[PDB]
UniProtKB/Swiss-Prot annotation, chain A:
Entry keyword Metal-binding: yes
InterPro entries registered for this protein in UniProt: Pantoate_ligase, Pantoate_ligase_C, Rossmann-like_a/b/a_fold
Alphabetical UniProt keywords: Acetylation, ATP-binding, Cytoplasm, Ligase, Magnesium, Metal-binding, Nucleotide-binding, Pantothenate biosynthesis, Virulence
Binding site for ATP: 40-47, 148-151, 177, 185-188
Similarity remark: Belongs to the pantothenate synthetase family.
Record-given protein name: Pantothenate synthetase
Disruption phenotype: Simultaneous disruption of panD and panC gives a mutant unable to grow in the absence of panothenate. The double mutant has a highly attenuated disease response in BALB/c and SCID mice; immunocompromised BALB/c SCID mice survive on average 36 weeks as opposed to 5 weeks for mice infected with wild-type bacteria, while immunocompetent BALB/c mice survive indefinitely. In wild-type mice bacteria grow for 3 weeks then undergo a steady decline, bacteria persist over 8 months in SCID mice.
Amino acid sequence: MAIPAFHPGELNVYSAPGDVADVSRALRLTGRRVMLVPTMGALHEGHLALVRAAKRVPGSVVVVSIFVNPMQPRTPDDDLAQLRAEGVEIAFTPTTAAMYPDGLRTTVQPGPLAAELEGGPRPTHFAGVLTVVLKLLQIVRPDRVFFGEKDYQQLVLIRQLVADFNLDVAVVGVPTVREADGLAMSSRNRYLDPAQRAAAVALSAALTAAAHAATAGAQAALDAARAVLDAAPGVAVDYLELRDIGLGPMPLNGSGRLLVAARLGTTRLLDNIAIEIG
Amino acid sequence: PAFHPGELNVYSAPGDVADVSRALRLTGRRVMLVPTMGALHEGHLALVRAAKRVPGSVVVVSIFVNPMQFGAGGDLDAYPRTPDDDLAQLRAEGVEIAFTPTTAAMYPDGLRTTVQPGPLAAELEGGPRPTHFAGVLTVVLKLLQIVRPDRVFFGEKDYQQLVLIRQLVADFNLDVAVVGVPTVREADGLAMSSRNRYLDPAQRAAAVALSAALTAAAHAATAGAQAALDAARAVLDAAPGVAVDYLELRDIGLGPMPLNGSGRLLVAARLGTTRLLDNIAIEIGT
Ligand SMILES: COc1ccc2[nH]c(C(=O)NS(=O)(=O)c3ccc(C)cn3)cc2c1
Ligand SMILES: COc1ccc2[nH]c(C(=O)NS(=O)(=O)c3ccc(C)cn3)cc2c1
Ligand SMILES: COc1ccc2[nH]c(C(=O)NS(=O)(=O)c3ccc(C)cn3)cc2c1
């Protein structure tokens, strides 16, 4: 009956889905606005940008989930220290068994977008992501949930989940945090050797070049991006695609998104950027 | 939108029922949902009455013939639709909200993100109908998200559906209680169904065999599972023009576990072109 212990202004850590559900419900009834930032731990500046965006909302209480979904790199104590330093009041750290007490059973089947782009090499990846995101949304019942624009296809699929299942949450996409030279933040970046790390800037350089080339039209944008990637050694491009903002076919003019994925040695990198045609 | 207590308020827009439901919840009323495909009968009304019994309840009945749980072959067009009787019945029952969405409002983007049920969906009713339960679970998930009820009510008649809905609720961590309501029957035992209207007089007479076989089995079960099944089979075999599709005795969760002391016996049979379902609790031994 009693609500689990919660101490305002401190980092409260809960591993039981029931506990965070009860605390979240109690906080909502005290008027606070529950913000959710889902992560897979091993926190970096990208995740912290999500946290800071959530904190800006007046009356916010921020819930950061840390869960490695086996269905879709673990430094527990440093993660929590970072969150404490950011003023996060709730960390939700469940086990696989807690999230999946009956094993894999009912799941989310995404639409056809999930088979495209990243879903090429990993046809079940987004099913896993949308299943765990749905569950976190139901457990926490946040007013808003924050995702990076980094994993843009993921973000679009989440927006499809929310629309399709009539979820009441607001989905907030946060602009990608980048290193000084433009490389999109990722825990994978540290795996690159110096030659690879130098070559890796070509992804962001190609995309930014395309965004500015776009005054000259879609083909000029695509060709500019390809030219930049073509100037990099050891960058195996998996795709470079200009789509509309919802990842359907790019319209003749208007707003779109340019997405790229590439392999450097054994490391796969992704990037994307807003494009306006003409 | 407006809401008038003690009267039947009908909303077609998901946003209207969502706003009204949330407002009611925030003023302390508990919201009950009874999801139906219309063509209401006393079985549906038993759900409504159970919902009404919850103190401080406001009852939302949804009526939507969900196109996603039908396959090609004319079944969708053939489903009974009795809009005027349905609403008249809800008024008579004191129901305050009817949610009657359009297909376009529910599926503005057609088939996109859906619910994939677990392996139970490929058995029994789902065996020859591979996407049927995905269709059911998808619309039920949407209705639950639109209405955000405290409790949602289902009949035990569609027992497999009920079990799958409990799976949906558990697996997606949904904050709703699922209430299963025992099957309402005609005087002779025939389970209530919107399909009973498709039995001619001879078929109606023969149709008592399903409930007779199940109830016989439930009492035969003191002598074990074989006795129970064989009693049911005998009754079905003695019935003119009953073509059995399946008769299965399973664990109560219909899941990947063997029968213990508590089981469910399920039957599906055809009388002419009309497919009827029934099921009953079984206790094995004494
Ligand atoms: C705001 O600028 C940024 C920049 C980069 C970012 N990376 C992530 C991130 O990785 N989040 S995660 O840990 O939940 C995860 C892990 C694996 C897969 C496939 C998708 N997501 C967020 C983020 C935000
Ligand atoms: C409490 O006693 C009873 C007895 C019989 C009943 N039938 C229904 C019923 O039909 N509900 S439905 O409209 O959601 C539906 C229609 C078709 C399919 C396949 C599954 N579900 C409820 C009910 C309750
Ligand atoms: C031949 O036996 C099978 C076995 C499994 C199957 N899965 C699908 C399937 O999923 N199709 S879908 O993605 O277009 C879809 C999903 C959900 C809803 C409700 C309707 N359609 C078809 C199918 C056929």
